[PDB]
């Protein structure tokens, strides 16, 4: 179906402890495929998925130089941002950037992104038009004015509509064994007595890929949203993800509760009950 390629970047200053640490990872969908960490002994962009390993030395050299250059500009940016916010040089601060592209089943651009956050807060974002900016505050407006003057958006649009989409197409083909396989959840319901009056029913989804999933409890056909504990979807470490949803069930009511599972690896949504 549809797919995404995203690059994530974080620089964290550490005054008195050297230069800011820079870490960047790239994903296709929910698959990590490259990483770079300036604190590695010999920083290089490194492969993290089998289908990128076939890229040749020129790819790794070029990607590594991009990463090193971004580490350097982020360090200049962190100095700039202290000025923009009238901050002291004494504290640690954070600069985050994400960019990339979403494509449909036919491979055409659906949406592009390029956005920054400073100290965990939105700073400046390229709008969906790939042509104008949303600045969060008067500091980010200074950046916006510089980027408008330099026609930065036009350069980003060209990457996001061109190279971004073409790389994603290549990766999806080279990785077609995995990137184009959905692993459905393995599902079951467990029962966990609390007291004589009530028990937890926990609906599990295990071993699934990609991470997107919907997992809901109904009672007598009514969604139990306010009364459901839904944990964040979590990595298993074998590419797959896990999730559970739990409800507190009065004694003897178990058969009134149904768990509902939606995942793109399932041809049809599942309904499950506790099976004593």
């Amino acid at each position: 179906g549809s797919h995404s390629m995203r690059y994530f970047h974080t620089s964290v200053s550490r005054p008195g402890r050297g230069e800011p640490r820079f870490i960047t990872v790239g994903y296709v969908d929910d698959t990590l495929f490259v990483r770079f960490d300036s604190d590695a002994a010999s920083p290089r962009e490194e492969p993290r998925a089998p289908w990128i390993e076939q890229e040749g030395p020129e790819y790794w050299d070029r990607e590594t130089q991009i990463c090193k250059a971004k580490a350097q500009t982020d360090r200049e940016d962190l100095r700039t941002l202290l000025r923009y916010y009238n901050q002291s040089e004494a504290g640690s601060h954070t600069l985050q950037n994400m960019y990339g592209c979403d494509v449909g089943p036919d491979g055409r651009l659906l949406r592009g992104y390029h956005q920054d956050a400073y100290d965990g807060k939105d700073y400046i974002a390229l709008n969906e038009d790939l042509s104008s900016w949303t600045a969060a505050d008067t500091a980010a407006q200074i950046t916006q004015r510089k980027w408008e003057a330099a026609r930065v958006a036009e350069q980003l649009r060209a990457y996001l509509e061109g190279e971004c989409v073409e790389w994603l197409r290549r990766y999806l083909e080279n990785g077609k064994e995995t990137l184009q396989r959905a692993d459905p959840p393995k599902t079951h319901v467990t029962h966990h007595p609390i007291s004589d009056h009530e028990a937890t029913l926990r609906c599990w989804a295990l071993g699934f890929y990609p991470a997107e999933i919907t997992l809901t409890w109904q009672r007598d056909g009514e969604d139990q949203t306010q009364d459901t504990e839904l944990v964040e979807t979590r990595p298993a470490g074998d590419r797959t993800f896990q999730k559970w949803a739990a409800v507190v069930v009065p004694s003897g009511e178990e058969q009134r509760y149904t768990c509902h599972v939606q995942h793109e690896g399932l041809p049809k949504p599942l309904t499950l009950r506790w099976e004593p």
Partner: peptide
């Protein structure tokens, strides 16, 4: 493959 266009805030 990455964006190769240095940008400064």
């Amino acid at each position: 493959g990455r964006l190769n266009q240095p940008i400064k805030v």
